[PDB]
Amino acid sequence: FDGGSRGKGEHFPYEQEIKFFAKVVLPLIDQYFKNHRLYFLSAASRPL
Torsion of CA 3, 17, 22, 31, to 10 degrees: -140
**Cα–Cα distance, 35 to 23 (Å, whole number):** 18
Residue 48 binds to another protein (criterion: CB under 8 A):
no
Binding-site size, another protein (CB under 8 A) = 4
Q: What is the dihedral of CA 35, 37, 38, 40, to 10 degrees?
A: 110
User: Among 9-17, 21-29, 39-47, which window interacts with another protein (CB under 8 A)?
Assistant: 39-47
Q: In the set 29, 32, 41, 47, which binds another protein (CB under 8 A)? A: 41
Q: Is 40 in the site for another protein (CB under 8 A)?
A: yes
**Residues at the interface with another protein (CB under 8 A):** 40-43
